[PDB]
């Protein structure tokens, strides 16, 4: 959008900060949930907690209105195409919260049927441990995503950030090479 054509002066910085504040608030989750993690997501929406306090009570039934896709449960092989379709049918900017161990790495179900982490099919922004994560853990992960969204760049700043993140990522060794103290 034209907000991405703005010059990199103070104008772009203020547009970025206001857009981040606006998007961190009103972060409507998609009406999407796979398993017991979906039950904990509902509990988070439930009175004991209040997802609504964060402007996130409107679980967008359609992906068009959804801004955040809380996977919230295990993703089977047959479901990955559906989850990717839902992700693609959301409109940018989009974010994916991998709620629970099943959504983030497959969790305990390390077998043929489970995808072993939704990042196999959709870009994940935050991983949320737990099986299921208790609602406070979900709110913590959501606030972490809010912090990430606030510092989200735009336009030329976005391009520079992408280049810098690429440069940093090209150098990190794989986890299999962090042999610290391994005999």
């Amino acid at each position: 959008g034209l907000e991405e054509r703005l010059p990199g002066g103070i104008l772009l910085s203020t547009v970025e900060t206001v857009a981040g504040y606006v998007r961190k608030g009103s972060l409507w989750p998609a009406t999407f949930g796979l398993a017991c993690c979906a039950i904990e997501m509902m509990s988070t929406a439930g009175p004991r907690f209040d997802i609504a306090r964060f402007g996130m009570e409107r679980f967008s039934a359609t992906p068009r209105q959804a801004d955040l896709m809380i996977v919230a449960g295990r993703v089977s092989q047959k479901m990955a195409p559906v989850l990717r379709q839902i992700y693609d049918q959301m409109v940018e900017p989009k974010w994916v919260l991998a709620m629970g161990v099943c959504a983030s790495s497959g969790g305990m179900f390390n077998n043929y049927a489970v995808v072993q982490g939704v990042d196999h099919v959709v870009p994940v922004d935050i991983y949320l441990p737990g099986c299921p994560p208790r609602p406070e853990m979900l709110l913590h992960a959501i606030l972490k995503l809010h912090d990430k969204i606030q510092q989200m760049p735009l336009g030329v700043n976005r391009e520079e950030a992408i280049r810098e993140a690429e440069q940093a990522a090209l150098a990190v060794p794989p986890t299999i090479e962090l042999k610290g103290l391994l005999r």
Binding site: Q77, K78, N110, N111, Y112, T175, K179, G180
Partner: protein, 220 residues
């Protein structure tokens, strides 16, 4: 028949599936037999159920249909010969004294070491009227994994014959449409067969990874 049904031959102490960690303990040979034919005075109402089934079915038909009778942990299993399954199922459902109207489903179990009887289908039946229950067991070889579908007798077996097929390849001949219900139709293999690998991935760690449990050593 009439002999114990060995589903696996376990050799070596401590449940080693291979040569074994300590020398000299691998020479034991213990066949793993499931409970065999029960002596005739079955417990509780099992005696009445079997007597009624043998009365409704002709002596010849009963002998041809009922391959075995087992009473294990106060639960009655009837090893029903393949082919004859629909007839005995109809008798069980319709006979007023049996009246096993509620079929709870079909469960597949794979015995890769049970020659000629690798694939077993288990039919848990319950009679609400008599507050009774039994299980039927139908064995089929891995070479011809065909069983008569009970769709006409127990429509509830629909999707079960499918799940059991999807996960074992039992063909349940005569089923209206035996299509995969859990796995995708393009899926290759039948996951719950023992020969089908678990299909996991190594768990990632800093400097190391743990292979899936099916690859790592186990004792049974």
């Amino acid at each position: 028949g009439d002999e114990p049904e060995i589903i696996a031959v376990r050799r070596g102490m401590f449940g080693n599936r291979d040569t074994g960690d300590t020398s000299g303990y691998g020479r034991l040979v213990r066949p793993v037999a499931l409970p065999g034919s029960t002596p005739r005075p079955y417990g509780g109402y099992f005696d009445a159920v079997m007597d009624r089934l043998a009365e409704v079915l002709g002596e010849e038909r009963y002998a041809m249909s009922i391959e075995r009778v087992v009473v294990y942990r106060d639960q009655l299993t009837i090893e029903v010969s393949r082919v004859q399954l629909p007839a005995v199922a109809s008798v069980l459902r319709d006979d007023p004294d049996l009246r096993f109207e509620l079929c709870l489903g079909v469960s597949g179990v794979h015995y890769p070491e049970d020659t000629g009887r690798e694939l077993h289908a288990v039919y848990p039946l319950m009679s609400i009227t008599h507050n009774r229950r039994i299980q039927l067991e139908v064995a089929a070889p891995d070479a011809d994994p065909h069983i008569p579908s009970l769709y006409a007798v127990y429509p509830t077996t629909d999707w079960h014959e499918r799940e059991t097929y999807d996960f074992f390849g039992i063909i349940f001949d005569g089923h209206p449409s035996l299509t995969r219900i859990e796995m995708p139709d393009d899926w290759e293999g039948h996951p719950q067969r023992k020969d089908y690998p678990l299909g996991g991935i190594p768990v990632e760690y800093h400097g190391a990874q743990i292979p899936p449990p099916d690859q790592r050593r186990s004792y049974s």
